Symmetry: D2
Subunit: 480 residues, 4 copies
């Protein structure tokens, strides 16, 4: 059991302490090799073959860089070797709970398959971590390196998911800044983002403009309303606004690419159709479904992107409907993108209303004669909440800064102290509509229903509206 | 025959022999001795690159864009002659830059000769004329199918704009050709694409705009009776990002507060040297640094080397200028005091710039001060940051097409894209510096500065509470 | 109907003609999304997650760049749009025959599982291409775009695998240069190498020093012994030696990494143990095994890296032995590397002798006290043939060059006309030894047998010889 | 008084201790901003605008990374903060002695201008460092941060230029510290790692050596009673590749035939200017270009600027020098005729270089020729290509360790690595050029050249059968 060096193309040669190597070399960690980081995005950006495994190594590594850098510059914080290891382990294990195709599984499939549960991959990560530890004899290995499992397991879990006065048990207040490394609940400025920006960009073929290494150099811990927090140099404020701008830009260009999303939707659909028939063996030989494997970590261990191919290659007549959806993916007979719009004014589309939207689009009465009627079943309506990670809030209002002439003194910097060219709002909704019927006449009709629906709901005019529905767009006074 | 040249940004590029003849002149080779980012090199040490290599890059990209349009749309009748003219314009577009590039036309000439309205682009047109005439290039143009009466004019118009349909070099059915090198309608041009990529490579800041993607999706469509370059509808987000990147490169690098003060110091040294340096132009006439812009033979010999000519001089008359450049090398720079912006609808007008150091020195901070500072001790640098068209959204001046009707041009408004985009497209930054560098002068300069910000109802400096703790409580709006 | 653009991180935005899009959007092509380019190398270099799919797009694209560039510079060659499409399709389809974990499948598994057949992934690519065309109605689509399927399918196949006097039917000798793009049988200078150099490096985190774009700019077709062939500028000769040096260096640093190879070996072992029990359905419902799916393209279509996980997640008691080997991979209880050596002198280890080598290692008699005796079954001996792509030959002796003052005149350039610092030989063998028993005492013993065996065979001294076997290495004066 | 961070595109954000900042902010250091790293190479590779200044920052930084990494992994070595600063200073100052156009100045000009002296830029760096320290009051600043100037100045100089135990600055138990900046035992030093990475970034050729990996695997072990830097055994292949890369960068870039002829032309102009240019040194004494190396105050003012000072001069005495530089700017370069190498055991010695143009002109090609050419018309450039230690394999002078005994040093021979490695480690290339550029002179120059190769039993030029079809059949060995 000695330290390993591993060559990562994003971070270079990184060092893994032998405790981390023991954690990595388990079935529960290695599972992340079989889950694509960007899910259906690989079917649009062919360089995006990367898996959660390598992202997880990167987050472990960066978490270690940030806590080491803080410890070197500020010995008064009393960051111990034990703290450093716990922060690295949390970085390493933070995404253990992702399911097949990553964001698809907790963003689309589980909410549709099991609308009663409130589940996130982060909860999965905590449960999977527990199962990793318990089934591989890791507690004695922790003790061998000076960790205290009652306290430190709890600390690690709290870093990943948040709390399970001062709500944490794993560390006291004098170590609060340690909870801001892996997953920053105050403002989202965390090393998870820095790894995925750099790694996704390298694979996508879109270039990263955020400099995380610069941020680490300028980061300090300062007292802010009587808690010790990570603060940035004042002159980095512009770079932080740019960080969130980059995040939003990566969601627009890649993560919410309209076809990447429809592939995720189709896979979700196939999983919903397969769910009654696929059996996954968990603890004590009990049988779980795709939707219930989240309840038993032994089952969930075996639930990866492989399930796609298990369905695609099946012959069972019961899986026929699921299998045909995946066949449609491989022949590229995808549901067709019709367009994009947004609400106007103070209108917000609520999650309770999502299910009713296909019916609304099909009920629009385009004032043009139509040969084809389309039914609700024929439309998909995907509502995407785009923000700066804190709903309507400006995350930079929850960051603290310091100045070169008083480096222990935290200050606030407001938006108006930076620039007038920044966003005026921090949240918005995009609505994408697609049609399951792909023939030319159905598609012409779907465009008319769509643009009419936008007019009826007082949504923004689709960008191509005048071209795809020339007879509809003149009817709307606010569009001309 | 063609030459190949290896550029680190674009790879191996081909130069037509007419371009090679233009490059191999004193007028073009001059660009090897003018830093792209001027004083920026004194802050970002990778930014050693010169205007020469930027110019090759713009020539190359100009050629890629016009070739791509011609291949996709043969009905436009883009000729080999048109391609060469566009390449030449890209190659020669920055011939007019002076020592330290933006410093020379942005700071020095306006101060040295406030009566003239000069730009490097005007310089590029005059330098091009002088390059052609003094190196026998007109017959070589003819040899390759160009018509110099028409094409020289076309080339110049591409660089500087017009010298109803205001252009003589090409008719309306070729208006798109004027949108490649320097796009007067919206600023979306290959010059930006080269400098984004090249500056980033050298600065150590990463480029996020994909120019190659833009070229693939570009088409020419009819818009209000002219053939113009349009982009695919779905690229609109990427164009907003393009201008966001431009603004971000100005914030991080080009307007870095110390890069600018170095540019200011060099400008100061040039103003102090201007009466004493003689540069010989055409017919043996004698020019100064500030007048060499009137004669391209003189201007040919004015490059960044003038910095070292002053620094190494022994002439007592250049003592004052020389001492400023010595201060740069010891890093005894004028000191940054801080940054602020106007509030509300307030605009600082160019006529008022000269009065601002006096205003800062006239502030009466209610604080005990060892030193009184005079107007001459402050520099107040006002920077106009925008999306290239003052208050306007340049995306309102772009045309788009949709996949289902690719010959039909459309407009896309800001509200059709995103609510997270900027609400304004122009703003002003105000940096204040002090020429007196000792600890007590600097403490005082901070008090005058923050008090001035309070008095003018400008934004609170980011470090205001720390540098002037007794001043910032006075102002209710902070 | 129309062209698609696709964004690749290595080549940027590439354009795909609609005929290529029809070929790509088939089960037979999309299969390549589930086959890792570097196989077991992903278990060593975590950035090497890339699959054969994206490599195939890249080779298609570069094949098109090279043939377009030749056509633009030399209209007299009469390169047609039809030729361009055929070269693109060949580049796109060249690796359709790879199996699970790529080089593992044709380099290790098939040779062990079916030693009677002479099979390569390239043969697989030809058969898979035939099956792709026939089962997706591609022939009429080819006709729609000006291709002539009798001739052009044959041309495409020949570009991939070679011939199936002038031995080719798809194109004549005045177009011989077209066979030098995707897979160059004369000297190995082909666009396949250029894509994988660039793509592997980007993912591995090792940097590429070969500039393929420069090579394309300087490439011309010239007459050489009555065939039209691709020639390089004279002054590029250095860069071509560097190309093969880079290839060799990527094999040393990554592709033949000792642990990447042992993982490939372990997976192969698990597949051999699973082979009797896994059923893959092929044409007419017939059942194939892992080792026989190469005989039926409908079965082979469904044979990808997924088989690893099918074994790993199985519960069938019959798959227990295969499953346990894959569990050993996941816990990193790997067969242990003992060391590396090479033959000396004139000695060449022949393929017929590979199987006898573990027995030789176990028969060595190290004069050292050992608690554990090891048997032949405990050693793995992996022999790797490292060369410049043409066994003992210098591939640069099979390249033609031209000079700036006579660009249509082909010439030869010998090694002595370039540099005295170049390699003296172009082939060698590396011998890696591993031990299947992983405890510290077995490993100590394995090192003594290994170093003694090297001494006995007069192989090169292992680099760490003095440290791992201090009592053995003094016996050998020449060490 | 506080640390500075600087953004370099090769190494990222690097930290500079305030003592380093004081050294950098002097005229003697800042001088390096005006000397191109690759000299005339910029006139072939237009991305290669980089100067010695940024290379020097990089070497300072890497020197610091290597010594820090050794200290972190091996606390028993007792590397102090003082040792780290001294190694950084040496890295930073190691190239202070370069002259105009870098390798051109000490490789071509000084040897020709002053054949009696044995001068290297490294000697210059030591003298320039001494002058930097003494004229900027640096010794008290060193003391303020824990350095001992009697000892540490000596240590710093020994690291730059070299020397029982021959060093005075540090004892044997710290010998490894002398292997960071300039490694005299085998050449594996951080100077190479910076220039590989930085040159590649600017040239547009990609670097394949991973220096960071080497740093991770580097350890100090006892070797024949000295503590030395050793590499992991399995890195041996990577080290052979390192020297292969060095050779490959010399072939592609640094010894590019046209880059060298430009260096030669500039050298020629400097030789013609040398009697007439005056550079003021200490106490107002006057130096020449060739003598400015004797006085650091003069040498401080000798940079690439001298090129433009000559080009723009009007003095009649500089006419010949000026005309050569004009020929560079119009691209009327001496023409490359070809390349060959000696055969067998033959080595061309430096004493014989001057006689070679005469030999080429004395060859008697049995061919009808329009022009007879004289010795003065040919340039013969002889280049020594090696792995940095003449005929020796530098890997024979490296020590390694194994994972199972990391404190135990071992040797690894070439046969333990690969049969595909080089069989020799040194060779000579001979390039011939002609000063007469017309077609008939050039035809003749090719005939003399190929005949000369045949007469001396040199290798057949690669294009020999094409440029001299009547000459190459005479030689049986071809
Ligand atoms: N020459 C090279 N260049 C770059 N990366 C390389 C490399 N060789 C390997 N890597 C990558 C592969 C891995 O990501 C990492 C480590 O590979 P090893 O350093 O080969 N270490 P291992 O555990 O095999 O040997 P041991 O136990 O004897 O120390 O570097
Ligand atoms: N091996 C190499 N690899 C990469 N870039 C290179 C290179 N060699 C040169 N460059 C860069 C340097 C230049 O930017 C460009 C062209 O250099 P040449 O191809 O050397 N052309 P020249 O005009 O000397 O030879 P001729 O007239 O005989 O064809 O490539
Ligand atoms: N903003 C962006 N920047 C870079 N690459 C991008 C990108 N957006 C997509 N890609 C990549 C993803 C793909 O690899 C490629 C094409 O994506 P689309 O241009 O979005 N084309 P699609 O076929 O969806 O829309 P249509 O049929 O309406 O033209 O570019
Ligand atoms: N946003 C940015 N991104 C990347 N590099 C940047 C940068 N801004 C500056 N640089 C580069 C330029 C330099 O190479 C380096 C340091 O520039 P500053 O951090 O601005 N430091 P200074 O001394 O001006 O301010 P103070 O004294 O208040 O700390 O970073
Ligand atoms: Fe994550
Ligand atoms: Fe420009
Ligand atoms: Fe391939
Ligand atoms: Fe150096
Ligand atoms: Mg997560
Ligand atoms: Mg998060
Ligand atoms: Mg301009
Ligand atoms: Mg412009
Ligand atoms: Mg502006
Ligand atoms: Mg293949
Ligand atoms: Mg091959
Ligand atoms: Mg040196
Ligand atoms: Mg050296």
């Amino acid at each position: 059991d000695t330290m390993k060096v591993i060559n990562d193309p994003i971070h270079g040669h990184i060092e893994l302490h032998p405790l981390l190597v023991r954690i990595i070399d388990t079935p529960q960690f290695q599972r992340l090799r079989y889950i694509k980081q960007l899910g259906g995005g690989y079917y649009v950006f062919p360089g995006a073959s990367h898996n959660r495994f390598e992202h997880s190594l990167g987050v472990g590594y960066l978490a270690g860089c940030l806590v080491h850098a803080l410890g070197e510059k500020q010995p008064e914080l009393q960051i111990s070797e034990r703290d450093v290891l716990c922060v690295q382990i949390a970085g390493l294990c933070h995404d253990l709970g992702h399911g097949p195709f990553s964001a698809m599984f907790d963003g689309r499939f589980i909410p549709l398959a099991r609308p009663e549960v409130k589940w996130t991959h982060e909860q999965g990560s905590v449960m999977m971590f527990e199962h990793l530890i318990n089934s591989n004899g890791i507690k004695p290995v922790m003790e061998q390196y000076g960790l205290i499992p009652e306290e430190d397991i709890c600390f690690i879990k709290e870093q990943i998911v948040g709390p399970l006065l001062w709500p944490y048990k794993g560390r006291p207040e004098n170590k609060s800044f340690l909870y801001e490394i892996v997953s920053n609940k105050r403002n989202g400025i965390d090393v998870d983002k820095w790894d995925y920006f750099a790694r996704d960009c390298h694979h996508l073929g879109i270039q990263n403009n955020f400099d995380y290494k610069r941020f680490i150099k300028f980061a300090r811990v300062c007292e802010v309303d009587n808690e010790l927090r990570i603060c940035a140099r004042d002159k980095e404020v512009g770079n932080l606004y740019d960080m969130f701008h980059t995040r939003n830009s990566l969601h627009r260009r890649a993560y919410q690419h309209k076809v990447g999303n429809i592939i995720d939707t189709m896979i979700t659909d196939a999983f919903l159709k397969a769910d009654d028939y696929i059996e996954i063996t968990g603890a004590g030989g009990k049988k779980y479904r795709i939707s219930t494997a989240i309840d038993d970590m032994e089952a969930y261990t075996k639930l990866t992107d492989n399930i796609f191919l298990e369905i695609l290659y099946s012959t069972d007549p019961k899986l026929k409907d699921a299998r045909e959806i995946l066949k449609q993916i491989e022949y590229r007979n995808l549901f067709k993108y019709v367009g994009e719009t947004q609400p106007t004014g103070q209108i917000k589309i609520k999650r309770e209303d999502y299910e009713s939207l296909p019916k609304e689009v099909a009920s629009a009465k385009p004032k043009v004669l139509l040969d084809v009627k389309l039914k609700a079943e024929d439309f998909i309506v995907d509502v995407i909440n785009m923000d700066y990670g804190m709903q309507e809030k400006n995350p930079i209002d929850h960051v603290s800064f310091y100045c070169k002439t008083a480096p222990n003194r935290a200050i606030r910097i407001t938006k108006n102290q930076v620039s007038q060219l920044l966003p005026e709002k921090f949240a918005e909704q995009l609505i994408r509509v697609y049609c399951k019927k792909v023939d030319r006449k159905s598609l012409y009709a779907a465009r008319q229903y769509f643009v009419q629906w936008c007019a009826d709901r007082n949504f923004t005019k689709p960008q191509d509206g005048d071209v795809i529905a020339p007879l509809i767009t003149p009817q709307k006074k606010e569009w001309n």
